Each structure stands twice: as C-alpha cells, then as structure tokens.
Amino acid sequence: GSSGSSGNTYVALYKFVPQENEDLEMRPGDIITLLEDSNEDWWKGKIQDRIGFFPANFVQRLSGPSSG
C-alpha cells in the first residue's frame, strides 16, 4: 500500500462461501486487508489471490498483541 492511510487487518474466523463472483471466499486462519469500511454490516477487503465483499460477523478486527 503506497502511502497507506488505514492499515486495519482482519482475520477470518470462519470459512465463507461466495455464491457469486461479487462475493469473496475466505478461510478460518487467513489474513484479509480491509480496504473499504464505509458499510457496517459487510466490509470489503483484499486477499492474497482473492478479492471481493464479505460479512463482518465472520472476521474480527486485529487490534494487536495484548500485553501489560
């Protein structure tokens, strides 16, 4: 990301099954790059070799390594 602004990463909790191209496929344990967060119910991101829309209730914003 050239001169990125919002570097928010999300880790897919469960596997998603896209019915149409528009939808994006993800697996439990992958890293998705949140690109568009205008919506609230569903968010858009970018995967290694995959791309598209996906539900937020499936992923969990990655805050970071919790520690004292």
Side-chain angles (χ1 to χ4, degrees):
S2 179
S3 207
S5 275
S6 289
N8 302 257
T9 320
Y10 291 64
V11 64
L13 304 156
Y14 328 98
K15 163 176 163 88
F16 188 90
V17 177
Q19 171 90 297
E20 300 281 314
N21 280 57
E22 304 302 295
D23 299 272
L24 154 75
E25 197 169 300
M26 30 188 233
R27 90 173 165 166
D30 270 2
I31 308 292
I32 299 90
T33 309
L34 198 64
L35 315 167
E36 204 270 23
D37 75 286
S38 203
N39 288 329
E40 52 291 292
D41 304 280
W42 286 47
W43 294 325
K44 189 193 184 162
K46 175 164 88 75
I47 298 191
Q48 294 204 256
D49 274 280
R50 282 210 90 71
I51 310 179
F53 316 101
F54 61 84
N57 83 295
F58 270 39
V59 303
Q60 184 79 252
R61 180 159 81 161
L62 276 156
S63 196
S66 274
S67 55

